[PDB]
Amino acid sequence: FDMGGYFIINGSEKVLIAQERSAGNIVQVFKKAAPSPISHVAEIRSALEKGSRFISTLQVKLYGREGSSARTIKATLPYIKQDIPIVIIFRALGIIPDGEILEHICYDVNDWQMLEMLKPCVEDGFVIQDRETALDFIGRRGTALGIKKEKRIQYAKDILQKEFLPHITQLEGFESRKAFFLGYMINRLLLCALDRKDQDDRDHFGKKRLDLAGPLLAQLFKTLFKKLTKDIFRYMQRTVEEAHDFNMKLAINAKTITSGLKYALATGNWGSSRAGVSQVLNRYTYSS
């Protein structure tokens, strides 16, 4: 009758309680009932399926309250300080004309309201009309470690090809696809601003993801493996730099993985980030 499904550390039956977190790679929109100039926020936590565990999150903000005019749209970018308008980003993605921008954002020519609310963004997008001036604009706005302009325009382009939207892919040439997806997010933001769709619910259980031993030990074993590789390479550089003999017993250590897995599955912490994950098994009865 022993159901199993637990671990044994130091003679103690430890159980990894299922954790709960939110999902990613889904466009979300929310309202702001505060006196902040932002009325609606279009958040989207982008991350790859396996590896690195990305935390970068894109945000498309809509400025200007209801009733007042000149309601522009500005979306933030990672590693870039101030926010950048959506149309300027469209110029940095290779799309120069504005009719194509309105063709990517709004997919219905009959609707005049969304296109009407696009006007101020088409004005600021009239101020900056070139793709090269847009790449130099994002190069001059955020990340000032490039110093040289010739390396900050190509560096900004590499940001738009790699860090910008980590999902889908990170190769060069996928700017058209990301332009269509960006216009889709703007279509969801403005479409939520026209009171045609309610605020995105976060209590929907389908948008929630649980984590058992699989994901937890994936993060843990991932970080521990990275530390192991880094330490092994440290021993390599010490060996070639100090000019001595090499040994396989001093390069690859086992107490990093043993102490990491044994310590994480032994204590409540999973490294305070996370606590209370591992609990002693309650043997009061069978239903307990």
Partner 1 sequence: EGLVEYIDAEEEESILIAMQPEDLEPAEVDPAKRIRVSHHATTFTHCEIHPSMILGVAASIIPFPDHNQSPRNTYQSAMGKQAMGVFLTN
Partner 2 sequence: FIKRDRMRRNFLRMREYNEFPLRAIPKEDLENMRTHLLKFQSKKKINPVTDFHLPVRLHRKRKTRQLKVLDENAKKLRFEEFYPWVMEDFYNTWVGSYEAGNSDSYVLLSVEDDGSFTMIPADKVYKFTARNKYATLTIDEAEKRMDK
Partner 3 sequence: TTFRFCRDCNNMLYPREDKENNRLLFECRTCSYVEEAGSPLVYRHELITNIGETAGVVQDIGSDPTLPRSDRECPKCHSRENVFFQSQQRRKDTSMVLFFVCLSCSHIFTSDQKNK
With respect to partner 3, which residue has the nearer C-beta, 37 or 97? 97
By CB under 8 A, residue 53 contacts partner 3: no
Window contacting partner 2 (CB under 8 A); options: 12-20, 172-180, 191-199, 207-215: 172-180
Q: Which amino acid does the sequence have at 129?
A: Q
Q: After which residues is the chain broken (C to N over 2.5 A)?
A: 271
CB 82 within 8 A of CB 95: no
By CB under 8 A, residue 103 contacts partner 2: no
Residue 26 CB, shortest distance to partner 1, in Å, is: 10
Count of chain residues binding partner 2 (CB under 8 A): 21
Window contacting partner 3 (CB under 8 A); options: 75-83, 91-99, 235-243, 250-258: 91-99
Backbone angles phi, psi at 3, to 5 degrees: -75, -20
Q: Where does 162-282 have alpha helices with state H?
A: 175-193, 213-242, 248-251, 255-266
b/e 48-60 (16+ beta carbons within 10 angstroms → b): eeeeeeeeeebbb
Residue 208 CB, shortest distance to partner 1, in Å, is: 8
| Residue 74 burial (10 A CB sphere; 0-12, 13-18, 19+) | buried
CB 168 within 8 A of CB 178: yes
With respect to partner 2, which residue has the nearer C-beta, 159 or 277? 159
By CB under 8 A, residue 171 contacts partner 2: yes
Q: Which of residues 121-180 bind partner 3 (CB under 8 A)?
A: 122, 126, 129
CB 47 within 8 A of CB 69: no
By CB under 8 A, residue 107 contacts partner 3: no
With respect to partner 3, which residue has the nearer C-beta, 196 or 262? 196
Site string (230-269) toward partner 2, x via CB under 8 A: ---x---x--xx----------------------------
Distance from C-alpha of 253 to C-alpha of 237, rounded to nearest angstrom: 16
Which single residue is written with the structure tokens 């389908």?
206
The site for partner 3 (CB under 8 A) is made up of 97-100, 112-113, 115-116, 119, 122, 126, 129, 194-198
The site for partner 2 (CB under 8 A) is made up of 94, 96, 127-130, 133, 136-137, 140, 154, 171-174, 176-177, 233, 237, 240-241
